[PDB]
């Protein structure tokens, strides 16, 4: 009836994909299944998964899928009667959560050597336990928060003042410069964002990202792979404990 929210019609040049992209994913998985011999299942648990473009540019000659897990599970076939190959329905239990496929004509030993040598320092992301305690120095705050030496540092942009205040830093504008208390220091004590060995929340994650300090490590973890020739799965070490489907 009446008394309802008014949803805004956005002036947007892109609309909702829906079944067009759904069928494009479906046909893509069908055309990808027979081309390449091995289908790896990998997982990204709590990462910002933005380095997938770099790993794709590295594996130009391999095709990685990371989309909707239930769509990909049915596309590979969760039952013995809809499967392209005999045992892809075995792989559709390793396909459980924030997981993806990776189709190759390359060798396992090489691919897990790659994925064990791959690791990139990235931003915290919610849920991670803080490996250290970060506290911005008392005084004029810079664009680093007392990690880089200040003598080689740049003052922070003044347009983040409302955002830092919203996230909860008692910061002020003195003569165009963002500061904690007084410009010459003293005044008050510092502001700690997160303490070591303590679960960090979304507010703390946003503060960390704005100050551009990374506290987490991005590494893709392989749950298990599939070889179509022998028609066999291979539980990878990680997949052992991961809540299978």
């Amino acid at each position: 009836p009446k008394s309802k929210r008014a949803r805004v019609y956005h002036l947007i040049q892109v609309n909702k994909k829906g079944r067009e992209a759904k069928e494009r994913l479906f046909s893509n998985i069908r055309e990808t299944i027979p081309k390449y011999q091995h289908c790896f299942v990998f997982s990204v648990d709590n990462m910002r998964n933005n380095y997938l473009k770099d790993v794709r540019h590295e594996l130009n000659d391999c095709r990685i899928f990371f989309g909707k897990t239930k769509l990909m599970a049915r596309a590979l076939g969760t039952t013995p009667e809809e499967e392209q190959a005999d045992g892809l329905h075995r792989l559709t239990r390793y396909l459980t959560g924030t997981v993806g496929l990776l189709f190759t004509n390359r060798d396992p030993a090489d691919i897990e050597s790659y994925f064990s040598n791959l690791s990139q320092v990235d931003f915290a992301r919610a849920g991670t336990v803080a490996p250290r305690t970060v506290t911005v120095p008392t005084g004029i705050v810079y664009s680093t928060g007392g990690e880089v030496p200040p003598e080689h540092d740049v003052p922070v942009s003044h347009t983040l003042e409302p955002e830092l205040r919203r996230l909860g830093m008692p910061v002020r504008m003195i003569k165009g410069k963002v500061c904690l208390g007084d410009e010459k220091g003293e005044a008050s004590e510092g502001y700690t964002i997160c303490k070591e060995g303590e679960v960090l929340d979304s507010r703390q994650t946003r503060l960390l990202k704005l100050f551009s300090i990374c506290l987490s490590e991005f590494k893709v973890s392989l749950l298990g792979y599939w070889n179509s020739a022998s028609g066999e799965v291979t539980e990878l070490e990680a997949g052992k404990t991961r809540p299978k489907r």
């Binding site: 019609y9 002036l11 947007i12 040049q13 609309n15």
Partner: peptide, 30 residues
């Protein structure tokens, strides 16, 4: 409010059309 609703409905239709897609003054002046 009537003027605003007519304007917003016309804007919605025009934006939908353009998102899907990918002389009297002269005589008087003379």
């Amino acid at each position: 409010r009537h003027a605003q609703k007519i304007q917003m409905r016309k804007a919605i239709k025009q934006h939908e059309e353009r998102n899907v897609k990918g002389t009297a003054k002269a005589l008087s002046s003379q």
